[PDB]
Amino acid sequence: AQLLAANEQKFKFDPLFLRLFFRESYPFTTEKVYLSQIPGLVNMALYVSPIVSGEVIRSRGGSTSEFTPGYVKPKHEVNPQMTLRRLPDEDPQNLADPAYRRRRIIMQNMRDEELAIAQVEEMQAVSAVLKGKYTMTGEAFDPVEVDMGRSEENNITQSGGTEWSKRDKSTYDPTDDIEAYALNASGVVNIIVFDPKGWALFRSFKAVKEKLDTRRGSNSELETAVKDLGKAVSYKGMYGDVAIVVYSGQYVENGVKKNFLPDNTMVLGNTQARGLRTYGCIQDADAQREGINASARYPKNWVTTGDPAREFTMIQSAPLMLLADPDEFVSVQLA
Amino acid sequence: AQLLAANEQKFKFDPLFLRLFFRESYPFTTEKVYLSQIPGLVNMALYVSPIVSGEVIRSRGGSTSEFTPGYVKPKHEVNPQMTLRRLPDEDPQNLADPAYRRRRIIMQNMRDEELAIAQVEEMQAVSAVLKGKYTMTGEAFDPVEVDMGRSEENNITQSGGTEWSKRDKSTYDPTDDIEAYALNASGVVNIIVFDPKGWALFRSFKAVKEKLDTRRGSNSELETAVKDLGKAVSYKGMYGDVAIVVYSGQYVENGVKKNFLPDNTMVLGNTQARGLRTYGCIQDADAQREGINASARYPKNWVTTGDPAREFTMIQSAPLMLLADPDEFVSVQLA
Amino acid sequence: AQLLAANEQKFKFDPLFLRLFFRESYPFTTEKVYLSQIPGLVNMALYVSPIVSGEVIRSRGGSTSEFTPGYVKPKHEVNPQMTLRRLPDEDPQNLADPAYRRRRIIMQNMRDEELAIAQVEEMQAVSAVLKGKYTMTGEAFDPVEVDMGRSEENNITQSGGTEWSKRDKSTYDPTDDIEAYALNASGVVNIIVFDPKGWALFRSFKAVKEKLDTRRGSNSELETAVKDLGKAVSYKGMYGDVAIVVYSGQYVENGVKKNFLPDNTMVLGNTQARGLRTYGCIQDADAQREGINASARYPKNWVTTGDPAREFTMIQSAPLMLLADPDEFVSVQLA
Amino acid sequence: AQLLAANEQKFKFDPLFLRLFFRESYPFTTEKVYLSQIPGLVNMALYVSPIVSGEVIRSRGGSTSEFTPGYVKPKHEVNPQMTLRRLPDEDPQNLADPAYRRRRIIMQNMRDEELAIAQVEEMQAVSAVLKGKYTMTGEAFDPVEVDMGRSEENNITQSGGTEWSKRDKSTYDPTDDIEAYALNASGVVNIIVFDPKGWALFRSFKAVKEKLDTRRGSNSELETAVKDLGKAVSYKGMYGDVAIVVYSGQYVENGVKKNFLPDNTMVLGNTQARGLRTYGCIQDADAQREGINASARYPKNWVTTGDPAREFTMIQSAPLMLLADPDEFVSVQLA
């Protein structure tokens, strides 16, 4: 087989969630996740006479600490028959030796597993910040529930009352709702991330377009996320004080492509909220000889004998995407 | 003649179908294509407990993996008598010695032959993704029928039931038919390309004339595509979730040009459908002499005598444009 | 006299038509012009089995060829009574030298006729896309007619029961009319350039302005091409996927100005319609001795004696502006 | 322990109430504060004879000049057992080093603790300008009151009379109130900082929303510092000659967040109002050994013995935030 260090990939393509909110990382050296282990917040030390000693504080961490990490591993073989994906400026003279062929196939595979697991970590983040709830269910795995702690006041639905659809899209102003739905924000909001038609029925109201700062030049540096994710991330501009992004990402399900965001939804919050990417242990003795229990991902190539005379190149990981404040975002169920 | 490396143009101008659906290419090392060696899709991340070895992910489902590539060969002369286009700001001193003149004529003939090959590639692509069928016929040259595998229900005809023409052009809403025909999508719908005359009656309905978005605010990237395809592509605008594009592409017959689309049809699809750009193998001893059996194009220059005492230059290839899933498109035949 | 190499002009001042429709240029090495020597268009592939060599592709183009270009030739004196324009920060010490003054005057002259020559091929293209007919007349000229091959629907005038001037200025929508005009365009309509007096009628409809996107920046390249013509061309805005231009440039006859376009007229076409820039031989005995019979322009300076005892500067050319597809544009004479 | 010079923070992040109004700092070498020692105001001039020598002008203006500095000293232990934010790609094996991890957590412990004293300074400032008095009480510390000198005619309540609540949000102009409260300002007003919900009802006013000059990049240069600490501060923009901002930050009490301002409160201030950042002394003999009795912040590292067998780090400082003029700002209780 090939050594573990055959991972010259070092590519960051986080789908707008592992690169905007959750930009802080935390691996563990334990099977479960102890949320209390995270330091947490500070609490404004108080006045004291300058003769006596202090009242040294620790912030005591968080209370609930018994969740289960997202252990995942996808399977592929390196059957030296697959057609090589053509790349620009390729010297075809090396196609004779299988040493180049299999080496290239392995690297393409590693790309495949990383892009596959990026989708699942993204959808965990999406499940986290759209309802507060999260459900890790799957075959060869037990059903697991995760409650972030979101209040009922952060999942407002447009179905009740007068909706954005059954209105006059030429005289009604849409702002009256956004601050009314962003008052319960627990922080200043500047991101109004929109679904494909979520921004459509929103634009239809004429009051949007005249003050919508459509100029490319703006203050928020969100344009960075534009140049990397030029497919599913569209930066509309400024709504005045807040920024607007429309998301059209997809995930490859068992046989079909499915949209990340449910169509009639929207989310409001701050661009600098805190998001955890807790990682559990790697459950491979092969790692415990090398002590790589605290890592992001774990690649491994081997050749198996006996009945299945094949060989594999695996990547195992355990993301358990979490949110520091389940109440710093508000989800509008559009209608 | 001239060295084979004299083949450089670096002009990748796809006609909306080699850029929007078949972005990924695959040459082979054998004359006949075998579908079984493509990588395929990538499943989500399917979960597993850290107690059992996971389940192997391989691409399966293809009934027949055998098809015959579309081998073609263009011919042209090198006679130093064709009316050379005069380049802006070129000195006439090199116009005297025909050495530079031939070096420019060969490049012009190149540009012509990539144009010809791109035309045949796009026509085979559209023949594939308009009905799931595929026909490739030469002058008494082996006819091969290829079926992509589309479900018959993805080729609905608007003539069924009531036509849009036999409907009120002022109060009727055609949306209902739009989502109804988007039901059998096997994925999300984002691409609603119309016919130059087909869309003309589409816009007749009044409510359509308000719910379209004509603003220059792009969805993601479409206008960067159309700016190159400025001769037969029109970006009408948004339709909420989807954007509206009208394609009036034309192919040059022996003496005339003809429309690529039938008079009244439209296609419903996703912006990120996975399509293959597979290429056959070179049937050239010289290429196999120097070993570029796997390629998309192939240059060669030589001098022939006796009957045609002239010189020729070939760019011979074998595209067999292929789609991963014919069922992710809905071709509604308008009437 | 001055050497022929004294051709220091390097100015690209094509008035809105040679710089947008006639990018390609084809000088002729023969006195007359034969249309059948254009390169032409190319067929699909002629699909063929890879066992037998195929037929060689030959492109001929058109049937009628025997045209003859006009032979304007400006000539001018350099009588050193010319009151030189005072160049800023130029020393009057050089003003003493007659040689420097003469060189300055001849360089000013060269600009003078280069503005005098551009206009003729300008209204050549104007007449080309106005009706597709081209009559060239004048004293000592032997007037010649030129038929570009236009149809009659490319010249429809709004002269029926309902006109843009005698209907509602508030409720009528000009769109349905503009697509009614552009349906028979043999391509995607992209330029709807206006005559200013006609645009005065056009803009009278408000339904224009609630959909008129007159944002600064046409497409980020049209303004890169039109700002240099800051005196004659103006850019209004976007009508969605298309641009609007108002042109009021004037050609001056012996004593007064005149606008190129007929007053209440507008034309429809595309930014990529290819137009020929054919030129003819320069029947100068010197030109044959310097092998420059094939060129666009030709400067000369010489000293005559006896009857017109002076010295003169000389220009001569052969413009026969042509468009590949005359029917690619439709001309509406508004009323 | 560690060297006293280990203080490398230099990342001043004062929450807009020490970088807007309290740019001026005045540490003392005396354990108390002597307001008469600060320069303050200096009088105009006198008309004196050119011969006779003029009298010396002294520096008076302050009569009451005695207050108790705000001493606070938080502290923290350095046990190497916490969970650390794994920074991106710097510690392949350095994580094994106990000393490296210890220094990292000490730096992190400092970075954590400065926020607490920043909170103290912020509450000092807001308690100063929201009601004009100051109270300073803490457990193991004496209660003491500080009198700014604020007059009650800056603490008007909107509830007095006809408040904004029982007022029209479409026709009434709140500007009349704005000057009706800005007359008793003792200086031009250009800061109208609001509270989130306080501004929410204010934004409901129509006259505001046509008069609200929201266009970004205003001539005001305060926003240059606003985007730095924008995590809890918005920026509404311009209201003509004045600058409108909304602040919604929270200080962390022992277990929860708490808004600095009462909900329906607003302020009137001038962009360059002078505020004092006077600090007390370090009544630490160890500190006094190096003559650092006059400073801003004081660090310490030292190992504990006997009862709490650990190692402690001290941060001690005595801010007693004051103002040049107490009545310069006007604090209106919204309604």
CATH of the domain at A215: 3.30.1930.10
Range A222-227 contact pairs with CB under 8 angstroms and sequence separation of 24 or more: A222/A271, A225/A16, A225/A19, A225/A20
Residues B249 and B226 sit within 8 Å (Cβ to Cβ): no
Question: Which among A128, A14, A129 has a CA at the least distance from the CA of A67?
Answer: A128
Cβ–Cβ of C46/B74 closer than 8 Å?
Answer: yes
Two tokens, residue B66: 């055998």
Other C-beta atoms closer than 10 Å to the C-beta of D255 total: 9
**CA distances for C259 relative to A150, C108, C252, angstroms:** 71, 26, 9
**The tokens 């996107």 sit on which residue?**
C213
Q: How many CB pairs under 8 A join A and B?
A: 136
Three-point CA angle C94, C95, C98, nearest 5°: 95
Cβ–Cβ of B232/C57 closer than 8 Å?
Answer: no
- Smallest Cβ–Cβ distance between A219 and the set D70, D216, D231 belongs to D216
Q: How far apart are CA B233 and CA B84, in angstroms?
A: 30
For residue A198, the surrounding DSSP H or E stretch is helix A198-204
Gaps in chain D with C–N over 2.5 Å, residue before each: none
* CA D252 to chain CA centroid, nearest Å: 15
Alpha helices in chain C (DSSP H): 98-131, 174-182, 196-202, 206-209, 222-226, 285-289
Q: Is B34 exposed, middle or buried (0-12, 13-18, 19+ CB in 10 A)?
A: middle
Residues B288 and B93 sit within 8 Å (Cβ to Cβ): no
Q: How far apart are CA D143 and CA D234, in angstroms?
A: 35
Q: How far apart are CA A122 and CA C149, in angstroms?
A: 61
Task: Give chain B positions within 8 Å (CB) of A123.
Answer: 44
Residues A47 and A12 sit within 8 Å (Cβ to Cβ): no
The widest CA-to-CA distance across chain B, in whole angstroms, is 80
Burial annotation A122-138 (CB, 10 A radius, 16+ → b, else e):
bbbbbbbbbbbebebeb
Residues A32 and A280 sit within 8 Å (Cβ to Cβ): yes
Q: How far apart are the first and last CA of chain D?
A: 55
Residues B235 and B229 sit within 8 Å (Cβ to Cβ): no
Does D contact B via 3+ CB–CB distances below 8 Å? no
Task: Give chain B positions within 8 Å (CB) of A252.
Answer: 41-44
Q: Is D305 helix (H, G, I), strand (E, B) or coil?
A: coil
Residues C257 and C251 sit within 8 Å (Cβ to Cβ): yes
Pairing between strand A26-27 and A278-279?
Answer: parallel
Other C-beta atoms closer than 10 Å to the C-beta of B254 total: 7
* CA C231 to chain CA centroid, nearest Å: 16
- Dihedral class, residue C140 (left if φ above 0, else alpha if ψ from -120 to 50, else beta): left
The widest CA-to-CA distance across chain A, in whole angstroms, is 82
Interface probe, candidates B188, B218, B288, B292, chain A, greatest A C-beta count within 10 A: B188
How far is B147 from chain C, CA to nearest CA, in Å? 19
- Smallest Cβ–Cβ distance between D253 and the set A44, A180, A183 belongs to A44
Alpha helices in chain D (DSSP H): 98-131, 175-182, 196-203, 206-211, 223-226, 285-289
Cβ–Cβ of D70/A47 closer than 8 Å?
Answer: yes
Two tokens, residue A325: 């404040």
For residue D58, the surrounding DSSP H or E stretch is none
Closest Cα in chain D to A187: D232
- Dihedral class, residue A266 (left if φ above 0, else alpha if ψ from -120 to 50, else beta): beta
Cβ–Cβ of A37/D75 closer than 8 Å?
Answer: no
**The tokens 């020929």 sit on which residue?**
C276
Residues D194 and D246 sit within 8 Å (Cβ to Cβ): yes
Residue D279 main-chain phi, psi, to 5 deg = -125, 150
Which distant-in-sequence residues (6+ apart) come within 8 Å of B83 by Cβ? C26, C28, C37, C38, C39
Question: What count of Cα atoms within 13 Å lies in the side-chain half-sphere of residue B192?
Answer: 23
Cβ–Cβ of A50/D73 closer than 8 Å?
Answer: yes
Task: Give chain A positions within 8 Å (CB) of D320.
Answer: none
Residues A321 and A296 sit within 8 Å (Cβ to Cβ): no
Two tokens, residue A127: 């499940």
Three-point CA angle C54, C55, C57, nearest 5°: 130
Q: How many CB pairs under 8 A join B and C?
A: 129
Q: How far apart are CA D57 and CA D43, in angstroms?
A: 9
Other C-beta atoms closer than 10 Å to the C-beta of C307 total: 6
Instruction: Print the SS3 string covering C137-162.
Output: CCCCCCCEEEECCCCCHHHCECCCCC
How far is B294 from chain A, CA to nearest CA, in Å? 8
The widest CA-to-CA distance across chain C, in whole angstroms, is 80
Two tokens, residue A71: 């252990």
Two tokens, residue A207: 């009051």
Cβ–Cβ of D75/A52 closer than 8 Å?
Answer: no
Residues B317 and B311 sit within 8 Å (Cβ to Cβ): no
Residues A135 and B64 sit within 8 Å (Cβ to Cβ): no
Task: Give chain C positions within 8 Å (CB) of B216.
Answer: 213, 215, 238
Residue A260: domain span: 152-274+326-333
Q: Torsion over CA of B136, B142, B143 and B144, rounded to 10 degrees?
A: -80
Q: How far apart are CA C296 and CA C114, in angstroms?
A: 12
Cβ–Cβ of B187/A92 closer than 8 Å?
Answer: no
Q: Torsion over CA of D42, D44, D50 and D51, rounded to 10 degrees?
A: -40
Evaluated on CA atoms A221, A224, A230, A231, the torsion sign reads negative
Closest Cα in chain C to B236: C241
Q: How far apart are CA B55 and CA B66, in angstroms?
A: 28
- Dihedral class, residue C106 (left if φ above 0, else alpha if ψ from -120 to 50, else beta): alpha
How far is A22 from chain B, CA to nearest CA, in Å? 20
How far is D200 from chain A, CA to nearest CA, in Å? 7
Cβ–Cβ of D217/A219 closer than 8 Å?
Answer: yes
